[PDB]
Amino acid sequence: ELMAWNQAENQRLHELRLARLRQEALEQERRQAEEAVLQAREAQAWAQLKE
Amino acid sequence: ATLNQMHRLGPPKHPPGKMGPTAGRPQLKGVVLRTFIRKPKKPNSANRKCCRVRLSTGREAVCFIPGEGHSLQEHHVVLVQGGRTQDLPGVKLTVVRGKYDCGHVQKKK
Amino acid sequence: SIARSSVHAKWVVGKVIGTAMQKTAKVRVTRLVLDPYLLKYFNKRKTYFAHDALQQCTVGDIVLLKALPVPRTKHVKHELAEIIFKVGQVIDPVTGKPCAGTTYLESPISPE
Amino acid sequence: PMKGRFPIRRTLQYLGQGDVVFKDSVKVMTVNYNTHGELGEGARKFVFFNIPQIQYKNPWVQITMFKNMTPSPFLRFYLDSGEQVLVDVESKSNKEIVEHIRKILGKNEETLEKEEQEKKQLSHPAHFGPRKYCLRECMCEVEGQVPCPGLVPLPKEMTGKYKAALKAT
Amino acid sequence: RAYRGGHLTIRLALGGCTNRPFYRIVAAHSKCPRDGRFVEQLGSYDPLPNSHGEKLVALNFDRIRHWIGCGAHLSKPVEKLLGLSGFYPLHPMMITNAERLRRKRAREVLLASQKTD
Amino acid sequence: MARKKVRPRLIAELARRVRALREQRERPRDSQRYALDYETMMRPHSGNRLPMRAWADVRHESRLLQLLNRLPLFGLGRLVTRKSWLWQHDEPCYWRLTRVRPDYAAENLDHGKAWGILTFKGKTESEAREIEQVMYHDWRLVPKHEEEAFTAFTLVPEDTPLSVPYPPLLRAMILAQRQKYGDTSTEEPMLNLERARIDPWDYPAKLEAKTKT
RNA sequence: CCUAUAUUCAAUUACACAACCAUGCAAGAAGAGACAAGUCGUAACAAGGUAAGCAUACUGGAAAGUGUGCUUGGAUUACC
RNA sequence: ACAGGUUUGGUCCUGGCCUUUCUAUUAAUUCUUAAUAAAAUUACACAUGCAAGUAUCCGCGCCCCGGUGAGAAUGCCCUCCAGAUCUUAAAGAUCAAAAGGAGCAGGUAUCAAGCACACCUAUAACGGUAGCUCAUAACGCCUUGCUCAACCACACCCCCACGGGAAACAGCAGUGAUAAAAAUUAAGCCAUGAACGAAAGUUUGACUAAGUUAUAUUAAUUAGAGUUGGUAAAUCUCGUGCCAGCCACCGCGGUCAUACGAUUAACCCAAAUUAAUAGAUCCACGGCGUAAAGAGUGUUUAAGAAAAAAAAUCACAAU
Ligand SMILES: [Mg+2]
Ligand SMILES: [Mg+2]
Ligand SMILES: [Mg+2]
Ligand SMILES: [Mg+2]
Ligand SMILES: [Mg+2]
Ligand SMILES: [Mg+2]
Ligand SMILES: [Mg+2]
Ligand SMILES: [Mg+2]
Ligand SMILES: [Mg+2]
Ligand SMILES: [Mg+2]
Ligand SMILES: [Mg+2]
Ligand SMILES: [Mg+2]
Ligand SMILES: [Mg+2]
Ligand SMILES: [Mg+2]
Ligand SMILES: [Mg+2]
Ligand SMILES: [Mg+2]
Ligand SMILES: [Mg+2]
Ligand SMILES: [Mg+2]
Ligand SMILES: [Mg+2]
Ligand SMILES: [Mg+2]
Ligand SMILES: [Mg+2]
Ligand SMILES: [Mg+2]
Ligand SMILES: [Mg+2]
Ligand SMILES: [Mg+2]
Ligand SMILES: [Mg+2]
Ligand SMILES: [Mg+2]
Ligand SMILES: [Mg+2]
Ligand SMILES: [Mg+2]
Ligand SMILES: [Mg+2]
Ligand SMILES: [Mg+2]
Ligand SMILES: [Mg+2]
Ligand SMILES: [Mg+2]
Ligand SMILES: [Mg+2]
Ligand SMILES: [Mg+2]
Ligand SMILES: [Mg+2]
Ligand SMILES: [Mg+2]
Ligand SMILES: [Mg+2]
Ligand SMILES: [Mg+2]
Ligand SMILES: [Mg+2]
Ligand SMILES: [Mg+2]
Ligand SMILES: [Mg+2]
Ligand SMILES: [Mg+2]
Ligand SMILES: [Mg+2]
Ligand SMILES: [Zn+2]
């Protein structure tokens, strides 16, 4: 009874976690947009100087 | 120290008592080799009657004779005990008055 | 139904110290022991030889030992049951996914 | 005890008062936790506060910690059958972990009280012997009986000396 | 300690102080010392009559018959005690000594009325 | 027990072996062993003296192989009885000899180990066995004609009551114990003596080592 | 070996071994301590009369002296 | 520890030594009687007596009890039990050798390496890998019974006991020697225990009841010991003159000594009282600029901490 109870509990937590990680993935892509912007700007500035 | 260091040394252990002149026994029996006299140390002076004894442990040692006056010759057996005499440097033993060949001090007559 | 070992150690879990002998893993097991003066817990370590049939064991792997019913030698009283954490290749028991340290090597939310 | 961060947890009392007692199926408990992250927090406090309590009451159970192996905190329990209990402790509090473990493999308060009842029927009140094991030594010390002659010297007649000197004459 | 042989037994340990005896009824190995190590304490017997003129005997009956049931052996005086209690039939020797005692009382009665003459 | 430095005691083994060997090799012939000095009543071998009550029976009576040496086949199938039995038990008690294995170191050939099948107080045991207390002098041989007079047995039943009262307190304990569980029956508790049967001390014990089952 | 048993044996050989220890005694040797109301100086303490000292080197009845680096556990009294 | 004395011209700090408590042995001085408890220098050598028999012959018992602490870091606690024994058909049960190990377990690291101390194969051998223990103390050396309803060990010596030294009290009493250390060459098996006996019973220096001893308690019939400078309760008059002597520590004695020696008075314990020696107790969960102590420097190993928030990077005389 108790081992089954524990099992169902771990599964509960597993679903919670999957939700949290999907969320984190989204927030992370947002970060990738920001960083891609900044790195593009500085790539340009560098290219200009060297040219 | 830290908790690790205290774990690593164990708790402090009381060192065993180092053993003295009577070798941990209350008395010793010994024969008189010589009777002589020793001056005390500097601040305070007299001349103190001592003897040299050989002890049942075979070790030979200077020993001191309490009371005023005494009769002790070579070959007398005495019984010695542990009190150290403060004036005399080096003299850690004391004759027991009233046993074997050292008699109790005779009241003035 | 009699198969037993007189050992207290019926199941242990420990690190693999060295593999140098044929088919035998050296395994450091560690327990918590309460230092009586400080009332604190420290790790006492002890080694066990374990029998490895397929010589499966790298050094550093966390491993589980079962007590052998009949001692293989004077020093070998255990057989290696499972490999709990392969060294530096670890599959998270929670989410079943490859991970290096605290990072996921393959994300559990990307099934397809 | 002065040194340390939470000195009260090095006290015999604190160690005693923790309540978890594993079933006898439990051999090994393995903790896996992280040194960082907010989520991991609870697990850490568990290792800091309760692991000492737990261990103290289950002195025969190997407890073993591992740091920063998996991205997530968990316990694993190894039983005698070969069965393996896996307990995910994630955003769970210190307290919640102790309670959940006590629930899965604990011992019911019933069980514990039966056990201690079997241990308290071990020293029987009516026996006689050394102070260590018994309430009384001689029966010299029970009220109505005959007193230890080391206290109240016997009437000359009960003395064996007197009996012998009587039979002689 | 390890012995060669010998059996489990129910006997009397003698505790007490000079002239004031006391007994601990005991299940012990046979070959071990009287007052020494034992397997289990069973009862106590206090020979000296108390304030109320009673000799107190205590018997843990349950455990006694547990051990008899494992084939422990009884001492003659423990036998006499159980018998007195009524947990065993009278020991034949109790009966016989009783009879002898009666005949002594008889011969002293006659000797008394013979000397009075 | 095991301490890592433990020494290998060799001579412990040597003395065991050697003692067992010198035991088997010097193992005494029972001819000299039970040999007896009839004047002093003292064994030469053991230096032991015989109990006061056995003296007369030692002077006046004969040990088994003393009556078996003058028998033709060395007495097989013959019936043998013991003086003690004849005095105590009026019902027949005899040994029927299966094997006899004398000891020949003896000049007069008076000693040896025997076997057979036993009848005690008329009851017969169904197996062969090694006879006990051969060396004793109680032994007597029954003649061929009287054989069927001794083997003659009047079979009588046993009158000892199969059951007896429990002892007074124990009876009370049982009574009260069954009142407690709601058993109302006032039928007296009885102690069953069927398996309490024991042979009188005269009955000879088997010298044969027991097979453990 | 028509019931069945009896009896025998189990000791050597090859080497190494007072080194190595401990415990006494010893021709002798060296140190420390206690030690004159003793002899020779004055090294230190005050810029102790050449500030002290450290490491190291060499030298000298004796404290100690000098070199080379280093320290202040010395001063330079402070609009000088 | 509820602390106290003692470093200095003085104060504070640090730091030892000692006092005050409790027990045991021995000694000195004193000692009236009971009871109870306990009895102890010696693994040196032992005169004499006794300590194991029972029983209709076989058998069964015969370091079991009792003795001792020599050896060994032995070992505590705990697994697992072959065997013996009892009972009974078996099953049980008591004692548990050998083998083991979760943990705990004397000092010494100026003992730092040990030197074959591991594993496989499989058939039990051939053969093959080259390991194993150890700074979380291996391997050594020293000291030692114990964690006590008890346990461990020994049983003249050579760990052992075939052999060999050689002729055995570490059973009860005794005795030589030896030591500061001093119980009866005693009475009973009447009770418990043990052995044997079918049994009445016999045996048992186990033990029971006694003998001896201020060793300890208690009870009363018993008064003596120590001390009186401070710590620390309590002193007066003589004698002595840095002498004679005294003290646990500080110290006392140089002609007006409460400190020596004796007297007077007192104090304090009391059938005891002091001294000597061993214990019990006692060190640091405290410290490291100047007092004992931050190791001349950095890196890694082992081992640990991560416990919440971030960082790696630009004038000048590194090498
Ligand atoms: Mg002076
Ligand atoms: Mg003195
Ligand atoms: Mg005298
Ligand atoms: Mg007593
Ligand atoms: Mg005999
Ligand atoms: Mg100078
Ligand atoms: Mg100047
Ligand atoms: Mg100068
Ligand atoms: Mg000058
Ligand atoms: Mg100068
Ligand atoms: Mg200067
Ligand atoms: Mg210099
Ligand atoms: Mg010069
Ligand atoms: Mg010059
Ligand atoms: Mg100035
Ligand atoms: Mg000073
Ligand atoms: Mg001063
Ligand atoms: Mg102080
Ligand atoms: Mg004395
Ligand atoms: Mg003993
Ligand atoms: Mg040794
Ligand atoms: Mg068994
Ligand atoms: Mg065992
Ligand atoms: Mg010793
Ligand atoms: Mg020996
Ligand atoms: Mg001897
Ligand atoms: Mg021996
Ligand atoms: Mg003796
Ligand atoms: Mg003996
Ligand atoms: Mg003598
Ligand atoms: Mg004494
Ligand atoms: Mg005397
Ligand atoms: Mg008796
Ligand atoms: Mg008797
Ligand atoms: Mg006697
Ligand atoms: Mg004085
Ligand atoms: Mg004067
Ligand atoms: Mg004074
Ligand atoms: Mg005076
Ligand atoms: Mg006294
Ligand atoms: Mg310093
Ligand atoms: Mg520095
Ligand atoms: Mg240096
Ligand atoms: Zn009493």
Tab-separated table of C-alpha atoms (C1' of nucleotides) in Angstrom, chain C residues 4-9 20-24 26 28 31 33 37-38 43-49 51 72-77, chain H residues 78-81 99-105 117-122 128-136 284-285 302-304:
chain	number	residue	atom	x	y	z
C	4	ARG	CA	22.658	-16.748	4.825
C	5	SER	CA	25.865	-14.977	5.675
C	6	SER	CA	26.996	-14.479	9.261
C	7	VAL	CA	28.128	-10.957	8.333
C	8	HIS	CA	26.381	-7.790	9.700
C	9	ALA	CA	26.914	-6.198	6.305
C	20	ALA	CA	43.556	-4.036	-9.938
C	21	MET	CA	42.783	-7.689	-9.103
C	22	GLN	CA	41.035	-10.019	-11.602
C	23	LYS	CA	37.216	-9.975	-11.299
C	24	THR	CA	37.394	-8.214	-7.925
C	26	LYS	CA	37.935	-2.929	-4.004
C	28	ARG	CA	35.265	1.815	0.147
C	31	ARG	CA	29.263	4.978	7.680
C	33	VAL	CA	29.721	7.107	13.648
C	37	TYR	CA	32.767	13.217	23.383
C	38	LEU	CA	31.663	15.746	20.817
C	43	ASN	CA	32.604	9.187	8.474
C	44	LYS	CA	34.399	5.973	9.372
C	45	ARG	CA	35.575	4.148	6.295
C	46	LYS	CA	36.145	0.440	5.731
C	47	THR	CA	36.990	-1.527	2.612
C	48	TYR	CA	35.285	-4.526	1.148
C	49	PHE	CA	36.333	-6.786	-1.676
C	51	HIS	CA	33.228	-10.225	-6.663
C	72	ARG	CA	34.760	-16.808	-1.847
C	73	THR	CA	37.957	-16.247	0.126
C	74	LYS	CA	38.876	-14.871	3.514
C	75	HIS	CA	38.642	-11.298	2.218
C	76	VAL	CA	35.788	-11.641	-0.256
C	77	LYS	CA	32.461	-11.767	1.480
H	78	C	C1'	27.210	-8.614	18.400
H	79	U	C1'	26.525	-12.450	14.269
H	80	C	C1'	26.682	-17.711	13.339
H	81	C	C1'	26.739	-22.038	15.245
H	99	A	C1'	34.765	-19.435	12.240
H	100	G	C1'	33.225	-14.432	11.755
H	101	G	C1'	32.366	-8.275	12.285
H	102	A	C1'	27.890	-2.719	12.279
H	103	G	C1'	30.420	-0.374	16.373
H	104	C	C1'	33.595	0.420	20.695
H	105	A	C1'	38.707	-0.868	22.781
H	117	C	C1'	51.239	-9.700	3.622
H	118	A	C1'	46.303	-10.754	-2.676
H	119	C	C1'	42.933	-12.365	-6.440
H	120	C	C1'	41.391	-15.466	-10.603
H	121	U	C1'	40.798	-20.121	-13.070
H	122	A	C1'	38.616	-24.008	-12.288
H	128	G	C1'	47.220	-17.148	-14.929
H	129	U	C1'	46.997	-11.966	-13.551
H	130	A	C1'	50.384	-8.672	-9.755
H	131	G	C1'	48.644	-7.643	-6.311
H	132	C	C1'	47.433	-6.971	-0.503
H	133	U	C1'	48.037	-3.806	4.464
H	134	C	C1'	49.091	1.329	5.939
H	135	A	C1'	49.268	8.830	8.567
H	136	U	C1'	40.960	7.429	9.385
H	284	A	C1'	41.301	22.922	26.125
H	285	C	C1'	33.994	23.192	23.100
H	302	A	C1'	43.603	12.850	0.860
H	303	A	C1'	39.778	15.046	3.495
H	304	G	C1'	36.290	18.720	3.997
